[model samples]
Target: EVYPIDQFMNNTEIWVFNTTQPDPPNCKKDKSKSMTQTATSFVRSHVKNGNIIEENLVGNFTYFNDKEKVYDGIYISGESSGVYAEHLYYVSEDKKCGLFQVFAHVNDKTTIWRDVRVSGRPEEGVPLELNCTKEFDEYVKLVNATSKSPYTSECQ
Candidate 1:
């Protein structure tokens, strides 16, 4: 089964992800579970060091599966210091909807996988992942708000 992603968009589509994979010091929920509140969340966030951050949109492209069907989606990418992250989500024409994320070392090309299902639907049961959201909050604690170049140096 495949779902067409033509109708999904950052400003219009409702998205929920997961993060409860059991890490340390960052075990908690930090996003609103309701669509009304989260409609503005995932769009501007990125994964860095298994963490999510708001660093503006670097770029995005239309996504494609190996099956050869082109679905509606933004192949979004972001770069901050030594970390480069990208998130791409699409509902296949076969009804399969998936979220793809990668947090990586800018020069070493090392990365972490952080993708999850959009789930059934915003109302069906696809609430955002508490563990995933926790990364953003926890990463903040590890860096200084005013420090920029330091993170890139420390990240490697």
Candidate 2:
């Protein structure tokens, strides 16, 4: 089955906090970010100390992949310009906390992976433990082992 995009289609705001990364040294501080999706548009904002540092309109909903079990889109602007990105959401059974993973393709051989914990409310400070499913747990393990360190300025 495909990811249920309808769950986030009602202009619901999803807050993201970096839970785990392959390279901690090059990673940005675990700042809270926001994502909201409408029927035709998706927006993401970087939040620090309750302020939006950067925001991008990351294009349309596009399509959901049952094979990869991820939602995909493209950048409408920003550094990567026309690059593609994929989002994998693992909402907890209770629906309060979850895991949100992003795979950003910068080039043919470079794919940046971000593993973040998600909450309905904007949380301050560090990332919190999420009550996600086994699939998310397994994916986290895989990312920790296989994902490469992001570029130095990738987070800036």
Q: Which candidate leads in lDDT?
A: 2
- TM-score for candidate 1, please give it: 0.36
lDDT of 1 by residue, 1-156 (tens): 222333333333323333212231121112222222112223333344667554443233334455536443333344443334334443433233344444456576574544343433333444345543344435444542221111111221
Report the alpha-carbon TM-score of model 2 versus the true structure.
0.51
Query: For every model shown, what is its TM-score relative to the native structure?
Result: 0.36, 0.51
Error of 2 at 60 (Å): 1.6
Per-residue alpha-carbon lDDT of candidate 2 for residues 95-115, written as tens digits (9 for 90 to 100):
444454444444455555554
Point out where model 1 deviates above 4 Å.
1-6, 10-16, 20-43, 46-53, 67-69, 72-77, 81-98, 101-103, 107-109, 117-156
Any residue pairs clashing in model 1, and if so which?
A: 1-94, 1-95, 2-94, 2-95, 3-95, 17-129, 18-129, 19-131, 19-132
